[PDB]
Amino acid sequence: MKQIIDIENWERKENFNFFRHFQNPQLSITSEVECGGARQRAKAAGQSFFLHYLYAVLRAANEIPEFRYRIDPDGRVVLYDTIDMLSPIKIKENGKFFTTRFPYHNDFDTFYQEARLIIDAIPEDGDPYAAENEEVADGDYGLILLSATPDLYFTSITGTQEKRSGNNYPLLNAGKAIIREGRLVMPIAMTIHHGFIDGHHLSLFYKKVEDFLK
Amino acid sequence: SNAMKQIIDIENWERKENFNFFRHFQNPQLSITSEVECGGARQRAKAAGQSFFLHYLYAVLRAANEIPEFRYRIDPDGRVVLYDTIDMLSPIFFTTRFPYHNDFDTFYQEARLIIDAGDYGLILLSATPDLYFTSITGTQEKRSGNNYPLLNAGKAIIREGRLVMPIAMTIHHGFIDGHHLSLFYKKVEDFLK
Amino acid sequence: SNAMKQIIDIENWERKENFNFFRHFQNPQLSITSEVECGGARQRAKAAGQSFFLHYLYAVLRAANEIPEFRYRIDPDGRVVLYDTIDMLSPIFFTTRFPYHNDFDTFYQEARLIIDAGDYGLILLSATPDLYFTSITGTQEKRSGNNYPLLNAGKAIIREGRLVMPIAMTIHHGFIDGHHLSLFYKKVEDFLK
Numbered sequence: 241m242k243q244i245i246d247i248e249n250w251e252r253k254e255n256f257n258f259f260r261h262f263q264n265p266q267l268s269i270t271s272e273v274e275c276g277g278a279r280q281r282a283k284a285a286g287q288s289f290f291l292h293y294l295y296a297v298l299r300a301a302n303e304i305p306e307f308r309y310r311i312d313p314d315g316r317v318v319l320y321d322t323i324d325m326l327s328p329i330k331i332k333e334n335g336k337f338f339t340t341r342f343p344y345h346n347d348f349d350t351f352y353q354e355a356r357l358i359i360d361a362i363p364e365d366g367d368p369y370a371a372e373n374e375e376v377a378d379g380d381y382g383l384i385l386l387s388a389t390p391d392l393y394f395t396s397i398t399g400t401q402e403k404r405s406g407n408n409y410p411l412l413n414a415g416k417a418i419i420r421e422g423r424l425v426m427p428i429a430m431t432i433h434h435g436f437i438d439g440h441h442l443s444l445f446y447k448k449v450e451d452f453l454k
Numbered sequence: 455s456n457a458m459k460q461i462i463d464i465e466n467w468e469r470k471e472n473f474n475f476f477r478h479f480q481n482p483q484l485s486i487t488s489e490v491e492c493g494g495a496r497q498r499a500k501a502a503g504q505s506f507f508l509h510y511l512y513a514v515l516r517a518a519n520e521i522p523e524f525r526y527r528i529d530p531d532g533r534v535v536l537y538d539t540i541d542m543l544s545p546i547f548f549t550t551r552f553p554y555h556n557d558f559d560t561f562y563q564e565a566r567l568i569i570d571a572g573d574y575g576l577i578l579l580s581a582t583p584d585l586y587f588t589s590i591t592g593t594q595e596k597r598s599g600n601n602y603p604l605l606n607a608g609k610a611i612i613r614e615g616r617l618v619m620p621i622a623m624t625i626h627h628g629f630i631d632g633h634h635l636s637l638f639y640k641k642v643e644d645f646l647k
Numbered sequence: 648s649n650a651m652k653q654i655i656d657i658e659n660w661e662r663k664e665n666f667n668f669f670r671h672f673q674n675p676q677l678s679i680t681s682e683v684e685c686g687g688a689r690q691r692a693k694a695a696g697q698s699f700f701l702h703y704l705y706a707v708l709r710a711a712n713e714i715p716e717f718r719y720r721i722d723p724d725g726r727v728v729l730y731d732t733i734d735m736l737s738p739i740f741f742t743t744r745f746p747y748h749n750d751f752d753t754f755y756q757e758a759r760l761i762i763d764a765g766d767y768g769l770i771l772l773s774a775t776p777d778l779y780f781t782s783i784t785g786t787q788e789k790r791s792g793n794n795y796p797l798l799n800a801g802k803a804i805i806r807e808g809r810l811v812m813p814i815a816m817t818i819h820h821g822f823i824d825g826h827h828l829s830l831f832y833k834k835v836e837d838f839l840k
Contacts, residue, residue, distance in 0.1 A: 262595050263596055266593065268784075368668075373668075389826070392825065392829035394828075395781040395813065399677065400674055402673060439585060479789075481674070483786065484783060484784060485783070487782035488780045614806070
């Protein structure tokens, strides 16, 4: 569910046309967020800390409309009503993962419990990229994707680039939560299309994620 | 144009091989992010009732002017050119141009007046004063790379007791090695710390 | 040849769908930077009058050798090859080859002698020990990516009482996931202490 954007109106007409013919219209950024609050809440509730920051990220993307803009399969700029989550869930100790979809819910408890059921249902073996190729086959780009590396603190991860117009959707990476000057912080990297998102929206995204994580 | 500039004699150019190495790369650019101490400049700008932004804008612009490698470009015909002097573009958003002056106070004065209102002899810095980051990697317009360096400045932050800010840049690797990057950041920090 | 190497049977390979996902991409590579503690190695190198450079160079080469994913290459004909063993290139600039040995002291000895003087079974590390950085993203030679992993080592710096240093790298996502990157950095840090 989405709107075809009237390019002639739309405040980013000129921003988007600037990057239209770029070899690489994407930018990657890594920043750090405090997350001590969500870690305490997760520990106390006996819950997955992963789902707490997954929610934080998914909610910020939904709440800042610039993060809902996509170049659809037919090459048209569209704005999705709602953005869901793809994430590569590790299934084996040698790194095997299976990518799967998590629906956004505005109520954390609802999101949390649907998330948990999805993870419990994850197949023992599987095609690591089936879920992504399904969304591409469907033409559903109303998604973001986050990959966790909970045992690695990084200062930079850049994204891959599928095609000239850029990836179909935003790609994110979460890293290890670590005490820095007495506060728990974790790194989050992302790759976005610069036609849709400037520094200013990235600032609000990270501010927003950190607010949820506390 | 109407810019000072020199067409480079490739055959007597000290970076002939360095540049030729990269010439058919799909992506000949590197991105680097580092951070610089900036407490001295924060304090000087506070004392003078001045824009902190223009202090670090100038620090960056001066460093690039003092390291020749930061002033090499590929003109519209694909020829290597050296610019004697480099000005600053910055989205204030409206992208505005700031001429370089050897003299901070002159630079500052002219920049304030400008704000109140194939030339590749430029760098562009984009500021996001509310966003700290450990990395930004920039766009790439065309195969041969962007027309000029693209920089990003982020939030000044107290890290182990010292005010530091991140500066990312994307440059063409044929012009610039790790040695020049190191001199660049060192010069920006010397002006700011 | 005469390398111990294997032409991978993609249809029966555990990474078939991983590799096939990335292999047609405009950019199938990813860049990562992370910091590793290295106080122990700095100390041990000091105590033994050794090159510290060679300690971390070794830690990196050893980590890549021990994780098979870091040894997969795309040969000149576009075929996936797995090298049993991998050596090190490093600009010393003379880009010089350092053969891997399982034993550190042996590697050290040979490396010191070497300095005093379509093969993709290699990684290349470029050290800039006076350059502090939080991020470097590398270049890309062709659509299919670089021929082998490119790395950058930066300045050793104290963070909250621990000596740490940044190591950046560019890899093919067809061969290497976050899981393997996490293991790579863990092994490097385990050696450097």
